[PDB]
Amino acid sequence: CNFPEYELPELNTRAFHVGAFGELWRGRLRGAGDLSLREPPASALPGSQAADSDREDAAVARDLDCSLEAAAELRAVCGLDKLKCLEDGEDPEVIPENTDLVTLGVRKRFLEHREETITIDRACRQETFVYEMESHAIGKKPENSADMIEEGELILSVNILYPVIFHKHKEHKPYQTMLVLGSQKLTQLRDSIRCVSDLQIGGEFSNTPDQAPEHISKDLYKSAFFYFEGTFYNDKRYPECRDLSRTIIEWSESHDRGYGKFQTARMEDFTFNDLCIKLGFPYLYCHQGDCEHVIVITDIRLVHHDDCLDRTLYPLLIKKHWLWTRKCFVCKMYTARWVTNNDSFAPEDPCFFCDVCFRMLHYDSEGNKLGEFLAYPYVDPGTFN
């Protein structure tokens, strides 16, 4: 059965059908209303419980098989005043000294050495992107009716690793994560990718730098595919698209290269519901013929009324790692726009140049080529990340 379980502790889980998983979840929630995207009543102090008592006590009595008086006593006993050690007017910026928490002791030890004139700041804690995105999207609703999340829709958290890999660290990975809906097709996710490889350009133009190519790689090549459970999902919507998976299949199945038999399908043929996929287990996505991304399904859960209900933002980026800009070697401060080879002036090969430095080093006022070198346009993946 489609019963999720760990394959390795807190690293990855058993495979299951996403559609069956969603149906099993909805079966355990349909008719109760806990899954609905409507705002429910909220707990409050006993001093203001009178208004909600009529609506709540009868339901409590029905569900807990207790009397209405017992429901009222339970509501009185479990009031928030028995737990709110903090008044609603207290600011979160100060540690309350009247506490026995070891956690707040450690927090005090952290804050005490961050109050000197050299250390006092309101700077980043450990990262920024997550809360900015959440506050930008959490709890919002769409401006169009067609852009509304359906009730009980599955939210899938998909990590896509960058093509630029560290090659020196292995604990953390360079990745960006989208939330996607079960009913979405893989075409939408692929079209939502803003990877720099689509912007790749080249060609040798040392003689005529203004003749840079008019077409980015996205305009030249549109091949892209996902790979799950041994199945390739190749895009074929446009004539520039080609079935990259066929070459991989021909190469891999001819020898005991360590992988089993695969099968090819179109990208429009499957929704996220149709996938039988693991959580945490790495998978593959590829585009532009050579740009491979590792795919990790970090999380899957049903939509909740506090979540981002605005479809226009989906696939909704939910985490993003950082890459450094390729600073040109001339000034070593500014970001490069060009790269040269066989350069008679550069101290090293390849050498990176900015749009100013390249032009006013390798050319004169009339634009005539100076010295001997080969030069190519460069788009920085650290910039367009």
Binding site: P4, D34, C78, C85, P92, E93, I95, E127, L302, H304
Partner: protein, 141 residues
């Protein structure tokens, strides 16, 4: 990540004391909570992101303490801990407990057992959490 730097010790101490009281009443848990002042944990110069992650991980750890094989009293204490953590947080919107598919039906069965056991305090607290919809319907906690 696993756990905050210190939360596990405080949670273990509070749950151990609750168990040692040999009582399941919510009154005793609230007395311990107010004596030790657990609710203050969500103050202390935590920025919104720090607060969101801290609430997520605290709720996850409390859910781990709430699941079996822990016995009746300790599970009840962990449910009270979950309730306190969720309802004393300062997030906007409120952060939810991560609940797995393999755990939701077991927790509903525990709610039914609590109702059958005539210990309505824990069942009411869980129903109040459901009214707050404190639970995310995830695959893992």
């Amino acid at each position: 990540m696993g756990t905050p730097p210190g939360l596990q010790t405080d949670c273990e101490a509070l749950l151990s004391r609750f168990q040692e009281t040999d009582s399941v009443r919510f009154e005793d848990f609230t007395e311990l909570w107010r004596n030790m002042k657990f609710g203050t944990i969500f103050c202390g110069r935590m920025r919104n992101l720090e607060k969101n992650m801290f609430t997520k991980e605290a709720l996850a750890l409390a859910w781990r303490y709430f699941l079996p094989p822990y016995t009746f009293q300790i599970r009840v204490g962990a449910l009270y801990l979950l309730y306190g953590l969720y309802n004393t947080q300062l997030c906007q919107p409120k952060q939810k407990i991560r609940v797995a598919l393999k755990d939701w039906d077991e927790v509903l069965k525990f709610q039914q057992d609590l109702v059958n056991a005539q210990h309505f305090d824990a069942a009411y607290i869980f129903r109040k959490l459901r009214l707050d919809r404190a639970f995310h319907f995830t695959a893992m906690p």
